[PDB]
Design a protein around this ligand. Structure first.
Ligand code: ATP
Ligand code: CA
Ligand code: CA
Ligand code: CA
Ligand code: CA
Ligand code: CA
Lengths: 354, 352
């Protein structure tokens, strides 16, 4: 039997089969109900006008259990097209997910889809394994949440975990705003998807923000073109690096939190002194919001200025890191000990969700 | 517990080396210690009894060409072996040409050698290949769809409607002598495909109106890249050369046949349940059913309450049909879970 790996993200669902090197289903974590009682994923976005669209997962924590049922139903029966009662299923959970939340995932998975067995793994931990590591600090940034998870010998240190409510959906909103100030028109949710595409294709992180800001202010050498679905071409200037700069300067979006370089530093400082050298040398980045060109060299620069000079700072940016969590779960569910660590339907029916 | 870790002495000194092979730590022969393949990942456990205490060092060595699944398995298994021995071992990550002195101390006499190659990755490469196919919609009463063995004009005619399926972009090509029922049924087949995949734009193309003006500059490029307009007249067949719409539909209704795979008293039986018009209520959730559309697709409907022997033998006999009838490579067997029936599967049922 081959197992299923479903990485329930805040904005995207990454699902597939254990043993594969990449997910076969990447669709938005969207449920659309009309103003065919439900629409999930891309079809819900292709029919925005008829429906109201809601996020079942908020900041990594799943909040609408009824609409999330439709996500998992669409995942099994529409995307993968598999009988869930035939496949063990590995799910992912956000760092510091409440226990009662993990219990309700198990309940739905067993007495709604009748899976034979299941297991829940932490998203940041799976990314570290995917990079071939058991010790390190993971920076996981997606659509709704950004975390700093220091992990030592295969287990996260929960006392030093940082949570930043600044992520990709906030960055997409910021790009809509500054492009509207420029003179363009992007306010609707349908235009949110246009700007999200602009963000993923033309944005990057400047190694020196004020110098890059001075470059774009004196010439047009940094300006790029973007073709709208209409065919109109628009010009993107300093907005290309002002949008990702919010990660390092949260005050751009109106947030007095520390930057992702400081939260990474503050997380390491909350761990024992005799493991920080390994934590500095193993900064593993994960998620789509970490896919900006130049974010690795900027993180390398900003952390080197905060850390002691005798410490070696190393940032690891795997090429396929927007799927690190899923790839990490694919290896775990392919190990012949996934059978030993999972909970079977009979054990759950007997003992319970505990 | 992994059966390759059970023989690890939990109190006495030892020195063991495992090699990751297809998601599994395979123990290395003792005399081969030090021979490391660059394409593989290893796990090295050293236990010495230094002055009455057991110092346990747990290293996983990563070759410079090791695959991602082997590096993750080595990391995952190192934690598993760490917790099995109480958690007291100390984990070290060792990369090729950058190993620690403690790791190299184990092999000073044994001679450390880096070897080329290694065992194949256990990953299955997902290529994300889009299924591009030329579909044919022909019929009078209710047009039936057929996948052509190629994408060209020599596979088409001027009397039917054809669907150029390209995944995200779908072309519906109307022949100038095509029926009115073929024009609407092709849209249902196409709109059902777009709703099954959740996205996609459908383009309606008329015969002779394939001009970048009344079609689209970028729309024409994709159409011409797969269906060149210049090779049309020599290759496209006449509406008369295409057979009778009635004879085509009669052929497709006859090839439909519904099999039933049920357990009964523990002895599995595969009877012929029905033919002709097929209805949704024929499919019972307590059993498995094989929908035989012949060379145009074998569909295994799997009910929720079906037995494991029903599910296994239903796929086996559906696969057996393909090899026995020596169908072409394009004839596929598709497991259809109850509640995950696609529009193409429902098209085989007249009432639903
Ligand atoms: N090339 C890119 N450049 C910048 N951002 C990108 C790129 N590709 C994807 N993203 C962003 O990554 C986000 C989704 O990534 P991911 O699937 O890791 O997040 P998620 O798991 O849905 O969210 P969370 O991590 O909060 O659960 C989207 O907001 C998208 O805008
Ligand atoms: Ca995530
Ligand atoms: Ca190998
Ligand atoms: Ca340990
Ligand atoms: Ca016809
Ligand atoms: Ca039965």
């Amino acid at each position: 039997t081959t197992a299923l790996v479903c990485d329930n993200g805040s904005g995207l669902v990454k699902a597939g089969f254990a043993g594969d090197d990449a997910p076969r289903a990447v669709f938005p974590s969207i449920v659309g109900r009309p103003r065919k009682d439900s629409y999930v994923g891309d079809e819900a976005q292709s029919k925005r006008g008829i429906l109201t669209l809601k996020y079942p997962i908020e900041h990594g924590i799943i909040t609408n259990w009824d609409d999330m049922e439709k996500i998992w139903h669409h995942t099994f029966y529409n995307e993968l097209r598999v009988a869930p009662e035939e496949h063990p299923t590995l799910l992912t959970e956000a760092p510091l997910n409440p226990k009662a939340n993990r219990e309700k995932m198990t309940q739905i998975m067993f007495e709604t889809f009748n899976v034979p067995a299941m297991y829940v793994a932490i998203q940041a931990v799976l990314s570290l394994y995917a990079s071939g590591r058991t010790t390190g600090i993971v920076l996981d940034s997606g659509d709704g949440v950004t975390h700093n998870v220091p992990i030592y010998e295969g287990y996260a240190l929960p006392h030093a975990i940082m949570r930043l409510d600044l992520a990709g959906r906030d960055l997409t909103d910021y790009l809509m705003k500054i492009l509207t100030e420029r003179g363009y028109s992007f306010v609707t949710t349908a235009e949110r998807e246009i700007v999200r595409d602009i963000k993923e294709k033309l944005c990057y992180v400047a190694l020196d923000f004020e110098n890059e800001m001075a470059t774009a202010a004196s010439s047009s050498s940094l300006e790029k073109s973007y073709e709208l679905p209409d065919g109109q071409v628009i010009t993107i200037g300093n907005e290309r690096f002002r949008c990702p700069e919010t990660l390092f300067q949260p005050s751009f979006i109106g947030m007095e939190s520390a930057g992702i370089h400081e939260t990474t530093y503050n997380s390491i400082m909350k761990c024992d002194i005799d493991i920080r050298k390994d934590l500095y040398a193993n900064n593993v980045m994960s998620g789509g919001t970490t896919m900006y060109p130049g974010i690795a060299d900027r993180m390398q620069k900003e952390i080197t200025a905060l850390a002691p000079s005798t410490m070696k700072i190393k940032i690891i940016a795997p090429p396929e890191r927007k799927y690190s969590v899923w790839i990490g779960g694919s290896i775990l569910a392919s190990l012949s000990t996934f059978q030993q660590m999972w909970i079977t339907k009979q054990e759950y029916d007997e003992a319970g969700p505990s | 517990t992994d059966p390759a870790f059970r023989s690890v002495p939990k109190g006495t000194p030892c020195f063991l080396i495992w090699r990751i092979e297809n998601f599994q730590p395979v123990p290395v022969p003792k005399d081969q210690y030090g021979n490391f393949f660059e394409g593989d990942a290893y796990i090295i456990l050293s236990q010495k009894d230094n002055k009455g205490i057991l110092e346990q060092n747990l290293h996983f060595w990563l070759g410079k060409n090791s695959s991602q699944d082997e590096q993750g398995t080595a990391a995952l298994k190192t934690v598993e072996l760490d917790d099995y021995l109480g958690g007291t071992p100390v984990q070290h990550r060792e990369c090729q040409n950058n190993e620690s002195k403690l790791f190299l101390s184990y092999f000073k006499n044994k001679s450390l050698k880096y070897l080329q190659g290694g065992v194949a990755s256990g990953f299955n490469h997902v290529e994300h290949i889009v299924r591009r196919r030329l579909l044919s919609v022909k019929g009078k009463h209710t047009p039936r769809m057929e996948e052509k063995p190629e994408i060209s004009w020599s596979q088409m005619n001027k009397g039917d409607v054809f669907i150029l399926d390209l995944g995200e972009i779908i072309y519906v090509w109307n022949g100038e002598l095509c029926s009115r029922t073929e024009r609407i049924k092709a849209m249902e087949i196409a709109r059902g495909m777009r709703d099954d995949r959740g996205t996609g734009n459908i383009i309606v193309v008329e015969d002779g109106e394939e001009t970048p003006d009344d079609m689209g500059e970028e729309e024409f490029e994709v159409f011409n890249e797969y269906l060149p307009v210049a090779d049309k007249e020599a290759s496209i067949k006449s509406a008369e050369e295409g057979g009778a719409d009635e004879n085509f539909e009669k052929k497709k209704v006859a090839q439909l046949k519904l099999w039933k795979v049920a357990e009964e008293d523990g002895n599995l039986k595969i009877t012929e349940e029905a033919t002709a018009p097929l209805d949704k209520k024929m499919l019972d959730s307590n059993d498995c059913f094989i929908v035989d559309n012949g060379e145009d697709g074998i569909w295994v409907w799997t009910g929720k309450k079906a037995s494991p022997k029903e599910r296994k033998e239903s796929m086996n006999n559906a696969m057996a049909f393909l090899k026995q009838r020596n169908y072409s490579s394009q004839t596929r067997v598709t497991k259809v879970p109850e509640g995950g029936e696609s529009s193409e599967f429902k098209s085989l049922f007249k009432t639903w």
